[model samples]
Every structure is written in structure tokens, then in C-alpha cells.
Target: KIDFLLSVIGFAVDLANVWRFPYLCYKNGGGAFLVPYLLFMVIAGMPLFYMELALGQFNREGAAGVWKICPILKGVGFTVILISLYVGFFYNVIIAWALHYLFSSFTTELPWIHCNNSWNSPNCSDAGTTPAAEYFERGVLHLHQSHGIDDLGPPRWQLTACLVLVIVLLYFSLWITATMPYVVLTALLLRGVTLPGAIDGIRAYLSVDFYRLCEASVWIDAATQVCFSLGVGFGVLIAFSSYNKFTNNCYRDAIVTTSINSLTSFSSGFVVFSFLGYMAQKHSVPIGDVAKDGPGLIFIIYPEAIATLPLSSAWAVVFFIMLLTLGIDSAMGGMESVITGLIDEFQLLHRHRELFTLFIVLATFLLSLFCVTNGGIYVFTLLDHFAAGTSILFGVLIEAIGVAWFYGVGQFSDDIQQMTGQRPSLYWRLCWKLVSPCFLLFVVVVSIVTFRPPHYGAYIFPDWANALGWVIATSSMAMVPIYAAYKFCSLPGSFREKLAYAIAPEKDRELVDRGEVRQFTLRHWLKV
Candidate 1:
């Protein structure tokens, strides 16, 4: 149980936890953002979190195999694996960037900490006056002269080598991978809290603007963050929990790990905001202006602040090390999901785990070469938006409907009781049956309502590039209905017979033979 929690919680608490949540809390009406965030946690995040765990645990299967609960909809399984594989390819490039920073931090001056590099524009000044935007765009990424789909440049071999190194590490042991990040977060957090002006930064992070919640954008952002931060649509939860014993109390595991995950995100805010507050005070800017979100916050702004600390080089090394280790946990979670799902589907692969792992790493590494190109950031941004952002929401929506509506929620709850010796509360049942599906559909609608074409920083994507992004998005999700109709039509039965066969669990007989059948006794139904 402890090992399981470490793996899941490790996956949930990531680089996003360090920088993304704090900026988001500060941006979307401060503390008020928590209202919609916690609200979504109930209606969507936690319910789905529990459902994924329960699905895998009950079926004793990985993410792809767990969809046997509704056989015809097994497209959802492939959906999960494809998303994981797609994400795994690009996500490690982020970690590779971190590793590059880690290697650079050993120098007397961090590259991003100052604007004196060859890449720096004349607009460069002190950290307060000059943005590190150019430093990152040119110095770190070496992005091409062309910003959009119009120009594709040669590969940056440095980043490609670093990406390969990160994948090699991922092929080894998950236990060591999980343990290292906690150590680094602790060191970075302790250093951050001790930075000058720490208290004011914490205050800035906690300060609330209640009116922002009135906008549809704020609620949507909050909802998306809930899913992203908690690993909702990511298949990591399902794959990791598949290894649990039959009677493992996944209900308790879900609540405990999720609570820890959110709290870790919250706590890292103190570490980050405290440092940003110190930087703002030094630069005489508003605390809000001191930091930005995403890569800019981590690679640029934070390094500037670290440069000011005593033993600055030492701090820079540790900070990038933290980022390196922090990102590895989530990266492995994604890679493992793909590997586990494939292994489960092909029993022949079981005996050749090492070779299979090598194949995955080599394949992912080769594909990721595109991400390391001079124009790679554009490609990376495009894939990230489509593979990680857009596709996941659709895949998770299918999961909620297929499991709760088609697979039978009451039956699922009864299965849970048989395994753990206790049933879920009425609240969870309603969440799975009605609230989760409705809330998820609302998120989908809002996202589409507000959707716009992709952009990187201020550079807009060309029409062709924009069209390609949509193609990527559709191609990933196209598998859902494409496979659904194929399986539905291929089955040798009448329409009603096909429909019945599609929704039924493939392993129903084996489950029942093991006395793991969903028994709806009056006592179980009345479970509160």
C-alpha cells in the first residue's frame, strides 16, 4: 500500500505542482480559485480517480485491459495507451531541458540568470528590467529563426543526447525513481523558505481576488488544473493500481493519495511564492509581476532569483537538480502506463521485459528527435497542446460514461464492496452515475466554447500548422468511434445482440467463478 501510494502520489505531484499551481492560485482570484477547484475535485477529479483505481483493481488488469468492463468500448483502452505513448514522447524533452540546466548549473553563473549571453537582445538589462525570454528562446532552446510551421530547422544534438539519457534512466527501476524526487523537493523547499522576504511571498500567493470567479474562463481554468494536477485523464493511476491485492482498500488509497497530492502542490506554493516574493522585493516589483507560469517561471525567473542567493552556484545546482528529479516522476508515470498497457495486451512480451523496454525507449527517443530540433519547440508545443491537453479530456469523458452509465455504477460499487469488504458512500455513487458525467461534459463544452488556435509565446501558428494541430487532436480521438463501429459491426450478431455484447464485460465468467460477482444485497444497497 505504501509503495502504491508513493507511485501514484509521485506521479500526481510533479514539476507542475512546483510552479503551475502557485501562479494559478495567484492569478484566478487567489484563494477563491480553491472553491471551483475543490468543487471539481468532488464532482469530477476524485470520483474519476476512485473509478480508475477500482476499475483496474477489480479487473486485475492494466489501463488497456480494464476496458473489458465494457468490451466493445475497448477503444477507450487503446485511447489511454496512445495518449500515454504520445505524451511520453514529448514530456521527457521537458526533463531533458531540466537535465541540461542541471549540467549548466555547476558553473559560476547560471546561463539564464544573466542576460549577457550571445542570444541576449539589447533590450536586456538587470533581471528586473530585462526578461529572460530571449535567453530561453535562443540560448537554451536554440529555436530557429522561423517561429511557426513555415520553417523547420536542423536538430539540436545537445538536447537530443540529453533526452536519450533521461529515457535510459527511465528504463531501470521505478522505486529508485520515486524516492529521489521527494529528497530534492525537500531540499529546494527548505532553501526557498529561508530566502529573503519569504513571508511576503507566501502572503501574495494566499491573497484572494473573489470577483475573478465570475468569468467562465476562471472556472474552466480551475477545472482543467484539477484534472491536470491530479492525473485524472492520465492512465498512470489505472496502471499503477492494477498491481494491488484483491482486498486493497482503494477507496482509502484514492482519498489519501489525492489529499497528499493537492497538499504537496499547495505546500510547494510556499517554497515558490516565498522565493518570488524575495525576488520582487529585491527588484522593487509587485510580487505578482515577479513570476510567470510554465517554463518561463522555472527556467528563467527562478534562476535569476537563485543567482542572488549566497553560494549562488550551489543553489543553482540544487534547484535544477530538483527540477530534473521532479519531472522524472511524472515522465516515468506516463512511460510506465504505455509499457504496462502493451505488456498486458501481449502476453508474449512478458518474458522479454528488458527487450520490450529497450524497444519503447528507442522508439520514443527517435520520435523525440523532432522535439530537439532548432524549430522543435514549435513542434513540442503543438504536440503538447494536442496530445496532453486536448485528447485527454475527450478520452476521460468516454471513461466516465462507459464505466458509470454502460458498465453499471451500482454493480461497480457492489464489486468494490466484495473486494474491500465495504461499499462506497451514496455521495460517490451519485458522483459516478450522474454528477461526474454532467460536470465532465460541461468542461468539454466550455473548453470548446473558448477554444482558439495554437500559439507559442506571442507567435501565432500559421493556418496550415493550426489545421495540423486539429488533425493531431482528431487522429488521436478518432480511434474511439472508429474502433467502436468496427467492433460493433464485426461481431456476428443482430443490432440488439451486438449492443448487448458490446457493453458486457469480457471476463465476466472468470470474475463470477472466483466469487467476485457484484452482489446487490439490500444491506449492500443501503450502504451509507
Candidate 2:
């Protein structure tokens, strides 16, 4: 039971908590950002987490199979699996980059610690010029003249080898993997605060820019971060919860795990902001300029700042290892979602899961080869935005509507009480029915309303490439309607009967024989 909790906690607590959420907090309004975050947590994020866990546990099925309990949206299961597969494809590329940095961290002189390298541009200076940035852009990426995906540049040989290492490591150590990020982050924070002028940077991080909170975008960012940070929308929760015993109390599990995920995210901010403060103090720069967010912030900016520390290499090693571990934890979440879906769908594969796992690794490795190319960052950026961002918003909204509305939250709650022996409270009931859907719908609407074309650094993608990205984003969602139409056309009945049959759970005569409640008959569901 403890291991299961630990594993779920580990999955939910990931790189986003460490980096992305902190940046969003500081960027949106520092302390004021917590307002929207807490609101979303209560209204949408935590409630949705509970919903998926309950659905998975009661149905005793993976994301794909769980939807059969309300077959009108069975395509939702397939859509979720598609999302995971898309994420699984590109997520490993970033892990490869982390592994590349990890291997480089072993050197006595970190490659980015000094600017006297072949990859260093003439404009690059060791102190203010972001040596690690050049190391990533020039050395690791080998980014030459191309600004966009006009060409499929040859793969970086070094990164290719490192990517292979990441694949092998994932295959072998998938069973084992956090700490000391807290310990080391704490150590670094204490050491950083005592450094000269740390207060200036810390103030910049925590200062309440209350006016920034007025922007609608800040609220949206807060809600989106909560969803992604908790791993709510990505089908990860459903997959993880499906493995539990029939009567496992996922109610308690959801509360405990969600709290842990948010707490870690909130705590890590102090650790990150303190160090940024120290870096600002050390470099004599504004805290605002000290660090921008994203993968580069962790791998490039933070590492460069660590180079300025006493025993800098030791700090660098620890920080990079922390990044890699957090990254692999996230990777496992996506990879497991994909693998679990496949295993659940094809019972025949259960006898040969290992062989199937090997196939997935090999396929992922080969497909990832392009990401090592000089122009790979462009593709990575495109995939990350279109694949992870927009599609996830749609997925979460659909999932919320499917379980809470279409599946009927009352029935859902009854199922939960049947297993856990406690009815969901009124607050939870209100959240599941009213608040959650409205919150997600706002996020989805804002996402579409504010959508922009894909771009990399200064280079805007051409129209055709941007169109392709939209295609990629829509492809996963396209299945939902496509499958619904397929069911509509293929099922033998009048339109009303077909609708009834579509939403009905599969009949289990054995359960009927045992005198268990028939929770999902066509007649029962129709009346509801």
C-alpha cells in the first residue's frame, strides 16, 4: 500500500513542479498567483483527479476499458491512449537531452563551465554570455544555419549515443527510481540566502504584483498548471488507479497524492527562487533577467549559475541528477500509460508483455533519432506545444464531461461509496457536477481563443508546417467523433435504441447471478 502511494506520488510530483510552476507563479503574480491555483485545485483539478481514480477502480479497467462502463464515450479511452502515445514519442527526446547533460556532468571540468570550447561562438563570454546555453545550442544541438524544419539535418552522433543510453536505462531501471532535491535544494537555498545580496532576488520572486493577477491569462495559466502538474488529464491517473484491488480507497489516495504533488510544487519554488536570487546577486543582474523558464532554464541557466558556486561541479552533478530523475519519473508516467493501454486491450499480449515492451522501446528509439538532428529542437517545440498543450486541454475537458456529466456523477459517487464505504461529500459532489466542467470549459475556450502558430526562438514556422502541427494536435481528438460515428452507423437499432445501447455498460450475467446491483442497465441509465 505504501509502495503504491509512493509510486503514484512520484509520478504526480515531477519536473513541472520543480521548474514550470515556479516560473508561472513568479511570472503571473508571485504570492498572488496562489489565489487562482487554490481555486482551480478545489474546483477542477483535485475533483477531476478523484473522478478518474474512482472511474478506473470501479470499472477495473485501464483508460481504454474504463469508458466501456459508459460506452457513449468509449472513444475517450482511445483518445487518451493516443495522447499518451504522442507524449511518449517526444518525451523521451527531452530525457535523452537530460542524459546527455548527466554524462557530461561526470567531467572534472564541466563542458559548459568554461567558454573555451570549439562550439563556443566568438560572442560567447564565460561569465555573462550563458556558456551552458552555447553548450546546448552549439555543442549538443549542433544547430547550424537552419532556423526551421526546412531540412531534416543529420542526427548529432553524441546525442544519438546518449539517446540510446536513455532508452537502455529506461528499459532496465523502469522498476526503480526522488529525494535530496529537497535536501540539496534546501542546502542550496540556505547556502544561497547567506550569500551577499540574496534578498534582492528573493524579493523579486515573492513580490506581490497583484495587478498582474487581473489578467485573464494568469488565471488560465494557474488552472492549466494545476491540471498538468497533477497528471490529471493525461490518462496517467486512470492507468495507475486501474491496477489497484477492487475495493482500494482511491478517495483517500487522491487526496493524499494531490496534496503531495501541490506541496512539493509549492515548496520547490522557494528552493528555485532562492538560488535564482543568489545567481542574481552573484552576477549583479536583475532577478528578472537571471533565469527564464523551460528545459533551458534547468539544463542551461541553472547549470551555468551552479558553475559560479563553490564546489560548483559537485552542485552541478547533484542538480542534473535531480533533473534526470524527475524527468524519468515523468517519462515512466507516459510510457506506463501507453503500455498499460496496450496490455489491457489485448489479453493475448499479457503472456508476452516483455517482448511487447521491447518492441515499444525499439520503435520509440528509432522514431526519436530525428530529434537528435540539428533542427530537432524545432520539432520538439512543435510537438510539445501541439501534442502536450492544446490536445491536453481538450482531453481534460472531454474527460470531465464524460465522467461527471455523461456517466452521471451520482452513479459515479455511489460506485465510490460502494468500494470505499463513504459517500462523497456535498462539496465534492458540487465540484464534480457544476464547478469542474465550467472551469475546464473556460480553460478550453481561452486556449482556443488565445491560440497562436508554432514558432522556435525567433523563427516562425511556415504555413505548411503550422498546418501540420494543427493536424498533429487534432489527430488524437479526431478519434472521439470518428469512433462515435462508427458506433452510430454500425450498431443495429433505431436512433433512440442505438443511443441507449451506446451508453450502456456491457452486461455481466455472472454479477447478476451473484445478486450484485445492476448499476448500468440501459433502462436504469435512461431514467437517469
Candidate 3:
């Protein structure tokens, strides 16, 4: 249990943690924002995380099937699986981008700085394009950040080629994932990280000021980290764990995953915060100003820190390599989940799981082409925010409702204890039963109420692009009604066929007598 999920969790903990959260903390309140962030994590993050993992084990159904197993909100869970699949389809772009940055290590000038390192030397090269990117995407504020490149941005050919490389890289990674040859990613991930220069980012991450806790967004940042980094509330975990044997120790796996994940996160703080302070000291800018958020932070802020150092080019290489390694496992893990779910959905490949595996890998390899274009980054943003913010939320809530209310948390708790042979602590108990449902409701409500268009800096997506994102997001939810209706309308005829086959009275009575068709029990629900 821990093995499968931890693989994913560690993947989540990588580059984004290094680049994203620290920027948020620094930007929101520097040393003052940790309070609300931590508060939210404790309240919203851990509780929901606990419940989702518990449901995965209890249902033993890969994502969509898990929803089909639980009666109420069954369609909702189906829809979430659809969302997970969508997210999984596009997840490779980040891995590819990480690799792109990893290759960028050879460049001399700080990649974040507009100091024209490429024009100055043979080894230095532009990062392809200087697309207008910004935070919260407000009009005037966006214009300022869009000004990173003075005049020349990325050349057309280079940008397009880089995008193709991203697609190729993603396809290769998906292959590695489906085969369960995860060591390739893990070995590389732990490689080059923790080097002397790598320590710059690592130390910066953890050099915390408790004073940061005073600010509200620090708590928000921390909570977001918990949510985003853990890959919580998504159906990925459920999909992967579906292969577990009935007696697998899900609770123990939970402990192993949670402990390791928390430790990794705590450790990451040391790595990122140290860089924040390091960059601040070097740039003459306040640590707060240099601290950016999301992909921007890693791209801009950390490089800023390195640019101030003598060996900036080498350090960029080490850091981005580490970042790439960090995400490798998780991306593959998510992909594996998608592939496995597909195989299960169309069991024609059951006789050839290996062949099915190969096919899925090959298909995703080709589908990754979108990431290799001049507009790759634009595609990445569109996929991430839309899929993550909307469909991802739907999936989390639906899955939670399935386990908590429909499947029965009491029974779920019983199974966890049975599997672990130990009682869960009161805190975990409370989180599973009470806290998760409440917070899921809150997030669902808030997301609906506050929903708006992209807020990236200076880069407002065209209306067509924005609308496309929403369409993709909403499309994920359609699976629920579609699948459930199919099951519903098809059920009567299917049951009749089954009954018809058991023409002998003895056989029919045996089915009912054996509890295989108990009138009102799970056995009676047409064996979903």
C-alpha cells in the first residue's frame, strides 16, 4: 500500500514543492504567512487525505468501478475517474518541461534573469521563448511580468522543437511507468540532488522563520501544498490500489505513506526556504520580492538566486535535474493508474495485460505531442488549472461521499482496523468521519462561488482558449451520467439474461440461497 502510493507522493513532493510553495509563502507574507497556511493544512488537507486513502482500500475498485460499487453518488465517482483520466493524459508535459529545464542546466546566465546570457557565450542559449506569463493574470500587473524579454523572445523553430522534445520525453516516461520499471525515475530523481550546489535550493527550502506563520496566505500556501503536493482527493490512489489483494494491509500502507510523505515535505521546507534567503541576500531584493509562486517561482526566483552565485549554470543544472527526478515517479504513477483503469474498463485485454500495458504506453507516447510545440507552456497552464481546479474537485468530493456516506465509514473504519490489526487514533478517526466531508463541501462551494477565468500575470488567455479549458473541465464530469445511465438501462435486460441462463430451479435457488442475490444487499445490485 505504502509502496504504490508513496511512489506517487514522493513524486508529488518534488520540483513543485521546491519552486511553488516557498514563493507563495514569501509573496503572501514572507515570514508572516505560515499561520493560515498551516491552519488550513491541518484542517482541510490531512483529514481529506485520510478519507480518500481509506476509501481506496475499502472499495478495491479502480477509480470508476469504485464509484460504481457505492450506490449513492455513484455517477459522481464515475465522473471523477473521467477527470483523473483527463489529468493523466496531460500530466506528461510537466515531466517533459522538467527535462527541458534539466537540459537548460548547460546555459551560463541565470535562466530567470533577462541578462542575455546566450548572446554573451557559446554554451549559453535562450530558453526558447519569452511568452507573456504572470501571476493572477490581471491586466496591468500581467504586462509588467510579460516584459522579461526585452525584444526577442524564443525563436519559432527552437520553441516548436522544444515542444516536440517534451512530447517524446513524456512518451518514453509513460513506457517506463506502465512496465513498473520505476527505478529508472527514482534513481535519477535522487541523483544529482543533494550535491553541494543542490544544497542551495534544499537549504533555502528548510530555513524557516516561525514568524512566517503570522500571515494568512502562508497557511493558504501550506494548505495548497498539502492538497497539490499530496495528489489528495484525486482518484489516482484508488486506481493504483485496486490491484491489491483483499487482505492487503491498507491501514499500515496508509501509515507508511503518510509518515514518509510528511517527512519528505518537512525536509523540503529546509531545501526551499534556504534558497529563498540565499537568493534574497544575493540579489539585494527582499526575500519576499524574489519569492514567486507556481512554475514561475522555480523558473524565475531560484534562477535569480543562482544568477547571484558564480557557478550559476552548474547549479541550475543540478537543481532542475533534481526537480525532474522528483516529478518522474509521480507522473508515471498517475499514468499507470490511467492505463490500468482503461484495461479494466475494457477487459478485452484481460487475457493480455502485458500487451494492454504496451499498447497504453505506446498510445500515450504519441498523445504527448502537444507538449512539444511553441504553445506547450500555454497548453500546460490550460490543462493544469482547468483539470485541477474544477474536475479534480468534483472527483474528490464524489469519491469521498461514496466512501463516507454511501459505502459507510463505519464499515470502512472496521476494514482498516482489520487490515492493520490496530486501532486508528482518535484524530484520524475524526478526520475520516467528520472533517473530510465538511471540508470537501466547503471547497466545492468556494470553487463554485469564486470560479472565474485564468488569473496568470499579464497573460490573459484568449476567450476561445479560456472557453476551451472550461469545456475540457466540464467534459470530465459528463462520464457520470453517461456510465450510470448505461448501467441503469442495461441492468434489467442483463439480469433477465443471467436468470435465463440459470434455467434450472435448483441453480436459481442456489444463487439466492448463497447470498449471491440477496434481495437488498450488494449481492443483489447486479454485481457492479
Candidate 4:
């Protein structure tokens, strides 16, 4: 558990912030998105993150039974757990793809750019029109019936290889070392911060689309990103902190870690957007176009970017590999949480921790195979929308209200301070108590208020796909109520309450050490 707090921060803040957040910012409003994004972070993201961390460390319930204190409020916990599993289920599928991609990077030719043939210039020519999976095994651009003379049909093999890499990485993360992901993520963040376009990337990240912040849809997207990107609604934070040492400086740890996690996102925003800006510069297209939407920015636009660079092949290979590694780490972190929840529920890990770990890991890997087998990127892409995009953020709103408002942010804060001796400042206090819940509610209402089908994408799906999207969204939303009923009446006396009050010896200690209600601590109190 060394650097456990930092590890958790790294885990919570991953590749999503790099590609995902910036895309949302640009699309919603080039500089407009930042205002709402920052506002939401203050109002919703940071507070929820800390609250969950405190709750987990206090009770040791890793999403299985943490919210029992307020039986009716337990749905909040379930929502988080549901989103985590849903995201992770498909997320692991992508982790394997990253592994395949990393291996693909070491060779000279870029798999995505170079064809199977070695005959032509570094870029693919005649025999190798299709993308290749391996750098060295690249073939010459070949003529194909469908694409004609120079057209490169996406290398199905290369994308498939990327999918496979995701699965393998998923297994190792769950089975071998769940902890390794966080460490690796820290390195990735550092890498992201130091790349050639690092400063520009950071700038792009910070640049908010201000007008977008005003647009109702933009605010909703911003809040959603605030919650999902930070792993707030996902039970991952609660689950991860369950391992906190009894005497750990959890409050300090939580604050520092949360700050670190936010910084990662903040920094990553700059790096990624900067790359897109660079792409825009090269294409003479609007930087606006290159980083427009999520799928567009990462899959279409960025790949085009990879192809157009000077030393273009080498940079493309390196960038994709870095991306793959970062994605693997994030995918694995979410998978690890899902596996952890399974053990908590079934009592599977009690007798043999290691064996149970292995089983869960293998099971996840196997289940992820569906997404791993073919061009699973599409499968992942589909899930990415409903689950990670919308469902998870909605879950965050519920979780915050359930815990911070419904269960009790005050009591939770008390416990946190008792454990770590530093009460959260007025900033956090106001956020958890009022700012966050209101903001989340606003986002939820506005998204519904300003609903519109997206107009972008290479191919709009058939009606059936549209219907399926609704189903996914509804299914995700459904979890909120089912678990609420279950938790309200039958909570085990063994666990903590929704008020964040627990039955442990620590509970008695907390009860005795009541907080200084309504005391403003930021004033002369600090000076005295």
C-alpha cells in the first residue's frame, strides 16, 4: 500500500482526461467548456471524491455494503458499483488492445500507417494499403477491390490486435498485481506532461469553451466529465480506499490524492489538446475540427494526425504506444475494482485471497473476450457512450446526493477530521454540503431539458442501434431504485449507516468528538 493515496489518485485520473475530457470541452465550446467543467469540479467532483474516500476508509466496505447506514439511500452506492462494473466490463476489453499496441510500437514501421510491404516509402504504398498490426511485418500497399488504387481500408488486423492487447492487460491487472496499475499510471501522467506537445496539451486542457459552459447541454457534458473522469460515481474510490491502513492519515491522504488526480486531468487536458492543435496547424484545418468530438478526436482525427507528422511514422508509433499504455492502466484499474466487488459480495475471497483473485481476474478476462475477439473496438466504442459517457455521470449525481446530502456529509466530514485532524476548508465544506448537489441536479435537469441526438459520426447507426442506445441508458438508470429498496429495510447492523456512522470502536470515538458546527475555520482561527 505504499504511496497508496497517490496510487489511487493516479488510478482515478487516467487516460480519459487526456482524450475524453478535452474532446468534450472542444465540442461543447472551444474555450466555453472550461467554465462549467471547473465549476462542476468545485461543485461536484472533488467533494464527492473526498466523501467516498472518507466513507470507505472509515467503514472498509468496498462498495458491497457501505451505504447501509441509510437503507433507502443505498441506491446511491449501487449506482456507483453498477457504473464501475459496466464501464470496466468493456474497459478491460480495450486494455488487451493496448498491450498489443505497445508491442506493435517497438518496431520501426508504424502499424497503423505502414502497410505489409517494405517496398515503398515509409508510408504504405501499393501492396500494403491495409493497416498492419506489426511494425516490421508491414507489407506494401496493395490494391484492393473495395478501396481502389491508394485507399487504405482500415487494417482490421491491426485494430483486432489492439483489441487483443486490451484483454491480456486486463487479466494481469486483476490477477497478478492490482496495485501495479496506479504506479504505471503515475509514470504515464509524467510522460504525458513531458511529451513534445506537453505544454500545448496542458494549455488545450485548461482552455475552456466559455460559451459552451452557458449552453445547457455543455454544462451537462461538463458536469458529466467532472464526475466520470474523476471516478466519482464509480465505487472504485470506495473500494480502493477500503484498503487504507487504520491509522492512515486518510483526510490528508484523501485531499492530497484528490488534488493529484485533478492535476493529472488538468495537465493531461493541455497535452492532448495541444496535440490536436498541432494537428490542426498541420492540416490547416481548424484546430476546432481536429479535436471536435470524442470518437472523432481520438479515433478519426488523431489517427489522421499520426499519419501527417514529420518523422511522422516514428511519432505516430510512439504516440499510439503511449496512448495504449495509458489506456491499459486505466482499464485495469476499473477492472480491479469490479473484481474486488465480486469478492466482497460472494465471500469468495475469504478462504484464499490469492486464489479468489486469480478466479476473478480470469473471469473478467474471459468475459472481456467478446470485446477482445474481433474488431472489438466498435464494441468498446458502443459501450463507451451509454455507460461511461452518460450512465456513469448520472450515477455520480445520485451518489453525491445519497451520501453527502441523504446520508450526511456533516457526519462524514467529522469522521474524516477525527481520523486525520484537518477538517476540510470552507471550500470543500460548501462544496460537499451545497455546491455539488445543486450543480449535479442542474446538469441532470438540463441534459434532459436540452436533449438532442448527436449529428456527427461517420455512419449514423440504424434505428435499432438508436433503440439499443436508449436501452443501455435506461438499463444503467434502472439500478438506482432496485438497490435502494434492498438497502433501506435489510441493512446488516454490522456495517456503517448512511449518516456515515459506523458500529466500530471508531464510531464511539467519533461520537465523542463532535464538530464545531457552523464555525468558519478559514478566518482568524488559522492565524491564532
lDDT of each: 0.72, 0.72, 0.53, 0.56
- TM-scores vs. true structure, each candidate: 0.86, 0.88, 0.68, 0.70
Cα lDDT, model 3, residue 522: 57
Comparing 1 and 4 on TM-score, the stronger one:
1
292-324: candidate 4 lDDT, tens digit per residue: 254424443444444544565565555556666
Ranking by TM-score: 2, 1, 4, 3
Tens-digit per-residue lDDT, 219-330, candidate 1: 7667767877877776777776777778778777778767887788777666766777777777788876654433445565566656656787877776677677777767
Model 1 residue runs over 4 Å out of place are: 1-12, 19-33, 113-115, 127-134, 172-204, 284-294, 347-356, 507-528
lDDT of 2 by residue, 1-528 (tens): 878756665654577787677767655546668778877886677778788888777777677777766576767777777877777777777677777777788877878767789888787764545677777778878776455698767787888888888889888876334455667667766666676666765676666677876667677668778877887777777776776788677667777877777777767676667666766666677776654433445555467557657887788777777778877767776787788788978889999989999998898888778678878878877776677666777878877777765666678778788888998888888887777777778777877787566555457788888788889878987878888888888877686556656665555434533534344455544432
Please provide, for model 3 over 1-528, each residue's C-alpha lDDT reduced to its tens digit, 9 standing for 90 to 100.
556764545443554455455556555543344455455566656656556666666667776665533432456654655665566656665555556556656765434455243223332223312211221122111222233222223324443455456545655766332323233233323432533344554444435566655433344345445666666755676665655665665545555555655555554444455555554444455544543344445455444444545566765676566566556655666666666667777768678886776676666655555544433445655675677665665666666655555444555567677765655677776665567667666656665566455544445666887778778877876666675556556544466544432221222454644545433455322221
Residue pairs with backbone overlap in model 2: none
Residue 49 local lDDT, model 4:
70
Which residues of candidate 3, in runs, are more than 4 Å off? 1-12, 23-27, 30-33, 44-48, 52-55, 71-78, 88-90, 107-224, 243-256, 266-274, 277-294, 307-314, 349-376, 423-429, 461-465, 493-528
Highest TM-score among the candidates is held by which one?
2
Instruction: For residue 127, give model 4's deviation from the true position in Å.
Output: 22
